[PDB]
């Protein structure tokens with residue numbers, strides 16, 4: 001029993017984190033095969049960052065301007081190039097700890113584990129959802145850039161996130177490992193803001209199913225609803241639309257618990273309109289939306305890596 | 306900035322997790338140097354659930370009755386002994402991935418990471434706290450016994466928990482790595498129940514300090530309190546007593562934020578009286594008690 005916000009075991013990724021220094025800036029890099037990946041803004045001074053011309057900044061750099069340390073072992077950089085907002089440093093040694101991995105780009109509402117790193121050293125791991133406004137509600141201090149986000153699927157690590165910056169509201173923004181930002185952001189010191197966020201409806205439903213599996217069922221009711229009726233309510237409450245594919249994805253949990261998605265949607269409708277009335281669900285007084293349906297199945301089944 | 310329940314990176318512990326089989330029972334072991342540690346109840350049969358005589362059950366076992374598998378490799382068990390409620394299987398290979406480590410017994414309120422494991426392989430990592438009633442609120446399925454809890458400090462893993470059992474309320478009970486249970490529990494299936502659980506007050510206070518550090522001040526007030534008046538009120542909400550040791554521990558965060566410890570105590574008293582009135586603190590609509598003072602300073606300031 002029990003239900004916790006749970007990250008993937010991070011060992012396969014820890015073996016890949018290195019320290020990258022350029023000039024006065026030190027941040028983290030991801031060492032896979034013979035390439036170290038990191039944010040291209042590593043090459044900027046603070047005044048460069050105001051309006052950077054990255055290709056121009058980069059051509060002046062020599063390989064020896066990139067100091068890469070793996071543990072207390074220096075790595076020799078033998079080439080450098082940029083892909084979108086990610087710098088690729090070719091090194092002379094393949095990482096012997098390179099795991100089976102892919103680069104994947106995730107969709108808003110999907111979750112992943114963040115391995116928060118400083119000076120190349122893994123320091124903490126936690127689970128994040130990609131918000132509908134393409135930010136993540138992370139915990140990152142100065143020096144955390146280049147920390148990465150990932151899932152594990154069988155024995156394959158899927159890297160989906162690299163950390164780049166903090167927005168003025170304290171939420172976080174970055175790229176996939178191919179250097180494409182999640183969200184309408186740019187790697188520049190300039191006024192940027194997250195759009196108004198919304199709640200991940202399919203994830204809330206998944207978490208209600210988690211609650212039921214764990215014995216927490218006071219919110220269940222006799223009613224059901226329609227997708228159209230439910231989505232009208234969800235729109236009212238800044239909840240993402242529930243689509244037919246979401247319903248299909250929850251199918252397993254609907255068959256396992258006896259509560260159909262639209263049956264549970266009627267529970268969620270009533271929670272939105274009437275609140276929780278002093279009660280909690282899995283120890284929370286808020287509706288939790290950072291567990292996907294797969295997260296709930298995986299945790300309530302004990303899948304391993 | 307930001308504030309999240311964060312776990313230690315699990316790799317140093319993943320490299321120590323093995324599978325231990327005795328008879329039809331399989332659970333997890335911790336392999337450090339040439340010893341595998343696991344719950345002694347791995348030797349129980351279905352007849353031995355209520356009143357096992359572990360000394361009598363163990364003397365009947367041979368080394369080859371213990372099957373220990375590290376990844377794809379079988380380890381040879383060359384000796385075995387019992388320490389309190391933990392079994393120590395000597396093996397013929399030192400684990401080449403053994404980290405710098407120590408065994409530490411923790412006090413209630415302390416936090417640690419759990420690497421939930423099944424069949425010797427890691428499933429996930431999460432953060433939790435030793436409750437005042439010496440249980441933990443874990444996430445554990447059948448087969449998770451022998452999963453461990455730990456902190457990491459620089460490069461050194463401090464093992465503080467190993468999982469033995471789930472109580473009827475769905476909370477979890479276990480031992481330190483010397484095999485001594487946390488709390489009044491025993492590794493028997495006889496009726497056992499945790500004491501009533503209370504909120505870890507010093508940790509709530511630390512978390513309020515974390516909220517101020519991250520820029521939230523809405524819950525502060527102009528009042529202070531004596532320590533005794535604070536405890537008299539807080540106990541009525543099933544909060545643990547706040548001791549002078551706790552006030553001292555909160556000294557650093559008090560200085561950092563400029564809010565005296567008993568001033569923050571008065572803010573907490575008002576929150577208990579008022580609720581949140583639809584607001585949140587660091588993303589929660591409830592007061593959070595599974596961040597220690599040490600945790601808050603680490604998460605907000607780093608090393």
Ligand SMILES: O=C(c1ccccn1)c1ccc2ccccc2n1
Nearest residue numbers: 118123124311312313603604607608
């Ligand atoms: O919050 C932290 C944490 C991590 C694991 C378990 C509990 N808490 C944290 C945050 C930033 C850090 C930076 C450098 C070193 C350690 C750090 N730890």
Ligand SMILES: [Cl-]
Nearest residue numbers: 410411412415
């Ligand atoms: Cl302690």
Ligand code: NA
Nearest residue numbers: 221223263266
């Ligand atoms: Na219903």
Ligand code: NA
Nearest residue numbers: 322376425426
């Ligand atoms: Na293993």
